[PDB]
């Protein structure tokens, strides 16, 4: 029997199949199930509020008219040639920015015909989806990225996508992301868009993401922690060396207010508070604090000896107060943050 | 009765249906009834001038060629394979700087015929659509971005663009953007392009977008209020110190003319002033007036005790005069800024 | 009579209409009409030498063989469907660095075919031209941009391009450049390349812009004026005090040469001098010349008393000098920039 | 004998050829060999983790059903217009983010058919491949970079993908990338795909490429080293000037801090650590200890003389002790280096 | 004598014209003559290592089956509309990263067809040529940037490229560069690719480029010039004053670093050493040098009257020592730059 003519009397104007007609055109609506393989993740863009993604889409669908029994070959490894003249489902990604195929050699598509009339259709697909982000707890923060595949024509009485029981969404092995870890748990939600046109199938999957913070504390909590130590200095400082001790005020607040400025690089623009801004805030507090203490020794110690020992008695305080009201403060953010972040897993 | 034969006989060469031929080609104008569906909004770039959407753009029109009664469905779902083969509109944006269509699967299209000839046609858009900016009053401004849907080919005695009775344009649920907020209610106006070639159809939307200043806030008030303050230290240091008095005055001149060159890092450059120019700008006014009031009083110290009291007395009044015109200068720039901006809703 | 067998008979097999042949094979060249209407202007950018525009670019020329007298109509509005099938110049733009044609609905065209044989084709275009810019006198330039329509195939003998009387360039209503100003009037020359494979016909547009130089003036004129003024304090401060007056020559410089570095962010790097490198090196050399004005007085005062009053006489001196040395140098460079920039209009 | 028929007789309608049909259908694999030329190599960007490469993809493989014996020729070098009808391997790159063909004047495409069979087929491509990179030991690391040939449609028992044992990695003469050195050995394993889908035949190649440290040296260890030097200079100047030594122990921290943060401006945020930080960590501490030294001079000076001899003594200590203890650490860190970057070849 | 009829009867079916088959199939090699005119030259950048060009390539060659007599015209004006149907040669630019065609209003080709069979085939194209450059004397270079053609299919026994004796590279009239200039000899290497397919034929011209200097002085040689001599400055602020001269010290410094790291821009990162970092290390070595001598005669003043007017004698022979160590080096540098850059003129 030969190759070439079993896909003519299977399908085309022999047969009368069409392309344009769904499988049961007035029959039980078909259930197309659907899987992922992502063979690639990474581009995850803050300031875009997307993401991109390279994955291999499978979707498994009955066709009656497809149903041979000519060839015992119990699969039929079909070259994509034929792709577009059979049915296939209208899918799409509601959250996609931007989208295209592959044709590095050759187009990038599976199809396999059984005997029941069951299709396997595999394709290889890139996408940029968008993605909302709450940007709240930023060092530390658990982000979600969104997936939605979603029917463009067919309603509920005609399409309905589903997921298998088994692994419905598969990573590659190795894939290590620069920024963030991938848990191995996901959750396939149901969504269904409700459009003045009518209903329409949608299925859902969630994508939940840890920040490293390792670059954060290396970049600005470290060196600001270091930068109001070295406020601290002047307290140690002799009490009458005036340009010394403003030079160790001002500078800070001059390396300060760059770092404040710097820490949100990539951040776009956001009118909530952030937990870095709450850090850098109360650190800047505490070394313009200091130059203003030192603003006031200054001044009490010109009232003209009881105003030099109490001008001295500020500076040995303040030598064990302010590393202590900052201590507290650590712990008021270091825990605070590892109680609430640690709530809301989901 | 087939489903294949049905479009043949309803449209094609039997039929003598030409696409190419609108509905009522010596008759009253072809109606298009318009509407869109914001599936995402973002991308608002300052510098470029334009801004990024993603629609469904829905069109319903009647055809009289079309009307069918030998299915006895009241409607009929058919795929985009046919909507090359039929009269479709020829819209298109004024105001787009760039487009493209959807194919992530097969080719985003919806169409459905109605027995009495009507016609409904959905399509997926991504637009970049310019928009003219007015960068006044930039910390606190009310934007006005554009649409405008307008015929190419056909004039007014051959298409009109129209809007429904019920929600022309339709925003997304839970759709939040990053830098501003738009509002719920919109305007449809009725442009009518009138060039050389003779008149055209059009319609137009507005969306309203408010800024939110929180960022800015956070980044170029803060911490100049806080240089300002820290500048106004030199009053209570030494006034014989003058390395200290002068180190106070030139950092902070020279960490306010980076912050004043940094506050317009996005801005696209503009000929008019912004009120974050005439805000940085009474600041710096400020500061370096500080400094020249030392300039003043280390010359008034050395005229050689009636010059030593007077020296002082600058400081004194300064202690309690500085803070005094800058708080007066705060209620006079954040009171007619919110009666304004107020000011103009549309 | 019916509207789809006309385009048949009008052109085609059965007329021998071919598109390959120009309408006057061997007579007269064909004289094609051109102009523009400017949609969209800008995004233009120094650094690459090019800029943006989105034009409506419709052209008109005679046809004997589309002459028809069978439809009364006089003009026949015709789709884009034959517009492929029909001839059409072969016009090409020489200054053009990328471009593309716009199909967000359908094909962006219109054509008309009238009862004497004319053809009315209309386009919608978005350019990316080159424009060699001079860049002296950069803060106040006048510069010229360029547009050329040349055909690409056929010669003098074949192919003729002109302007109407009537408006060959319109630009939108209400068009407003960010940082330059279009004027009103246009330079329509006729340029006519000679390459070695022959004669090519050719039209050229001007476009005047003139910059804006509100935004250079708020950030490297009166911040380089403040800190020329703020030089000038070293003058009242006290001569004994080496740290200040050492301090206020060295911190002007640190700011100015950071001032100067930024000033040429956007430029492309040109071997010539600008009206801004004259600006800033001669506020440079002033307060240069201020520190080594305090280097001449500190030698000056230690000679071991009439060493002391010749240091102070400098510091009179100089208090009286040197702003009268740069208010002659600001006559004399806003003087001589708006008799020159306002000298070569075109 | 004609060229033209013979593609006819050879191939078609009339020989029965199906280009949809692999050539042994029920039989052995067909054993596909593949060699690649790289033309040019480089854009090898670390933040989106990958680089671009251009390659000579050439593949040879046995078709029974296109072998001939007509023409005397033992070679049939034939143009690329019969390469669509033809069966082709369907290769794709498995770590490819984006590729293109090239067409500047025709199709980038070669193709010989020998008397035996046999087909040879050489194209041109231009990749963009995803490389997993591990930044630890940043200035000095050894990279690999991979290459995936797999089959998309073909199972094992159709398809085999083999190298020769002749070069199947050839690289251009004079090729020199700017930033790396590409090894002169290669290794070619043999990766195998096991999908939910099936099994899949694939190769793989890796490229070892080492970074030129003399960028980094002259950027962030020399001037470092400089700044630690000149942190050093506060030991030789006079304890009791404060100004001067606080001078120069806060300007040092000031640049440091400046050149931390952009010592990682092209790495993507990865939580580890590199050496980079540990070398400017240590210098930091380093600089910083300088400053916590002189304020623990200060402190001691003023008790109130066996106080002042004990504070230069710390001084002089601190002269012949800090460059010890950072000759040690440049040691302990130059040999570290040399030893482990060393070690790990592969 | 009809115009459609003739180019049916010159080739296709009738007359048994193949354009997948070259003129002489079994004889001598097709002889093509090519030739280049630059319209357009800019876009160079350093850091990618290559450049964009737009260019017109014209083609020559010899068709004995396209000769024709019956038409009396000498040449035949041909639209591109058979330009797919005539044998074409398989150009290709080996080092081009990116190129497209021209299609802003028709295709952007021409062809002629003379008496005697020859064919010229011009056509227009973007090119993004990738060249190996050598950054070392970086502010004063001479680069070579590269562009060869080359055949894909064909062999030297098939297809031979050539120049003309007259202009092969002709480049248009007021075509300068930002930043370099373009000689006006060329030379034309005949470069012969030799891979294991076999021999090809290919050709090659060369463009030798100046930079032009006068930026980079304006930017990193004059401003560190002011940067030196303000150090030297310190040489006659009194030896006394300690936080003037350290100020001196570490502020130039402070300054020099920021320079040096951001003279470096552009260039992409590069193992060896350039002329710029010669001359700001230098300059580096020399403001440190002048710091450590104030650390030098600051120990050497406090050794307890001839410590202190040893202590002078090093100020005094400083101040007429660095001007005369640096105008050597400057001696040295701008003899051993203009003696060697004007040697290696190829
Ligand atoms: C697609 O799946 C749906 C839901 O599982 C099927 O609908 C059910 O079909 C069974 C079998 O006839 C009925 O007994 C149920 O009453 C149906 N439920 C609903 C809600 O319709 C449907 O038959 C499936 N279609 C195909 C082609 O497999
Ligand atoms: C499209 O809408 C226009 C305006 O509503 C219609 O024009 C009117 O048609 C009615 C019905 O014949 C007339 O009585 C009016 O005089 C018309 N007004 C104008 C200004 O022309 C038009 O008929 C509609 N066309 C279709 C096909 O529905
Ligand atoms: C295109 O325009 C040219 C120039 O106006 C026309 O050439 C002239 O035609 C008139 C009418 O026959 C002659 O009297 C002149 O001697 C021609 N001048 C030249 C320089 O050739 C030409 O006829 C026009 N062609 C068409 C088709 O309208
Ligand atoms: C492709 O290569 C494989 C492996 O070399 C070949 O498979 C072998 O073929 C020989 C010859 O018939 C047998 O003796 C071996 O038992 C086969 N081994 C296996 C593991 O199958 C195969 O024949 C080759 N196919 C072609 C078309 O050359
Ligand atoms: C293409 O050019 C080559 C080289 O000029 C030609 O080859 C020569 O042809 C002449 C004329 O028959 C012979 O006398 C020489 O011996 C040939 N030399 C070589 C090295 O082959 C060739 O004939 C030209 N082909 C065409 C079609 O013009």
Redesign the interface.
Same mark, same amino acid.
């Given at each position: 029997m030969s190759?070439?003519d079993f896909?003519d009397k299977l399908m085309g104007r022999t047969s009368?199949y @069409?392309?344009?007609?769904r499988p049961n055109?007035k029959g039980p609506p078909v259930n197309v199930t659907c899987?992922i393989?992502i063979?690639?993740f990474?581009?995850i863009a803050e300031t =875009?509020?997307d993401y991109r993604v390279?994955i291999?889409?499978?979707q498994k669908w009955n066709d009656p008219r497809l149903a041979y029994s000519e060839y015992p070959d119990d699969s039929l490894?079909? @070259?994509?040639?034929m792709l577009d003249s059979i049915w296939? &489902? @209208?899918? #799409? #990604?509601?959250?996609?920015?931007?989208?295209n195929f592959?044709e590095? %050699? =050759?187009?990038?598509?599976?199809?396999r015909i059984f005997k029941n009339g069951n299709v396997?259709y595999?394709?290889?697909?890139?996408?940029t989806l968008?993605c &909302?982000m709450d940007l709240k707890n930023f060092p530390m923060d658990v982000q979600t990225c969104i997936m939605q595949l979603e029917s463009?024509?067919?309603?509920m009485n005609?399409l309905i996508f589903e997921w298998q029981d088994?692994?419905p969404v598969?990573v590659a092995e190795?894939l290590?992301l620069? *920024?963030f870890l991938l848990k191995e748990e996901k959750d396939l939600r149901y969504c269904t868009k409700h459009?003045? $046109?009518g209903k329409f199938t949608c299925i859902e999957v969630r994508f939940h993401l840890e920040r *490293?913070?390792?670059?954060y504390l290396? *970049?600005m909590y470290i060196?600001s922690l270091?930068?109001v130590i070295?406020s601290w200095?002047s307290f140690?400082?002799?009490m009458d060396?005036? &340009?010394?001790r403003?030079?160790?005020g001002? %500078? =800070?607040?001059? $390396?300060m =207010?760059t *770092?404040?400025?710097?820490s949100?690089a990539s951040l &776009?623009?956001?009118?909530?508070?952030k937990a870095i @801004?709450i850090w850098m805030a109360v650190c800047?507090l505490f070394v313009?604090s200091a130059?203003?203490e030192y603003?006031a020794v200054?001044?009490v110690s010109?009232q003209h000896k009881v105003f030099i020992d109490r001008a001295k008695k500020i500076d040995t305080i303040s030598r064990a107060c302010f590393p202590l009201a900052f201590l507290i403060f650590n712990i008021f953010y270091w825990v605070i943050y590892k109680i609430l972040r640690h709530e809301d897993i989901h």
């Amino acid at each position: 029997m030969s190759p070439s003519d079993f896909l003519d009397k299977l399908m085309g104007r022999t047969s009368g199949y @069409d392309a344009r007609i769904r499988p049961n055109f007035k029959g039980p609506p078909v259930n197309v199930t659907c899987n992922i393989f992502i063979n690639s993740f990474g581009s995850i863009a803050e300031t =875009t509020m997307d993401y991109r993604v390279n994955i291999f889409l499978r979707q498994k669908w009955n066709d009656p008219r497809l149903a041979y029994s000519e060839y015992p070959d119990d699969s039929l490894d079909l @070259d994509p040639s034929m792709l577009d003249s059979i049915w296939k &489902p @209208d899918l #799409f #990604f509601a959250n996609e920015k931007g989208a295209n195929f592959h044709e590095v %050699t =050759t187009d990038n598509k599976l199809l396999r015909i059984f005997k029941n009339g069951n299709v396997l259709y595999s394709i290889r697909l890139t996408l940029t989806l968008s993605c &909302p982000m709450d940007l709240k707890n930023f060092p530390m923060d658990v982000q979600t990225c969104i997936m939605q595949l979603e029917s463009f024509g067919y309603t509920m009485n005609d399409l309905i996508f589903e997921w298998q029981d088994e692994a419905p969404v598969q990573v590659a092995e190795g894939l290590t992301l620069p *920024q963030f870890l991938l848990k191995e748990e996901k959750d396939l939600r149901y969504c269904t868009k409700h459009y003045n $046109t009518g209903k329409f199938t949608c299925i859902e999957v969630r994508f939940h993401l840890e920040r *490293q913070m390792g670059y954060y504390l290396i *970049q600005m909590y470290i060196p600001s922690l270091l930068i109001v130590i070295l406020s601290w200095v002047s307290f140690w400082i002799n009490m009458d060396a005036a &340009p010394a001790r403003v030079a160790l005020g001002i %500078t =800070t607040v001059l $390396t300060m =207010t760059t *770092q404040s400025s710097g820490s949100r690089a990539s951040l &776009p623009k956001v009118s909530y508070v952030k937990a870095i @801004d709450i850090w850098m805030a109360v650190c800047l507090l505490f070394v313009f604090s200091a130059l203003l203490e030192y603003a006031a020794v200054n001044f009490v110690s010109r009232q003209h000896k009881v105003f030099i020992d109490r001008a001295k008695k500020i500076d040995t305080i303040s030598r064990a107060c302010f590393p202590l009201a900052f201590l507290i403060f650590n712990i008021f953010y270091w825990v605070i943050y590892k109680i609430l972040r640690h709530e809301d897993i989901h």
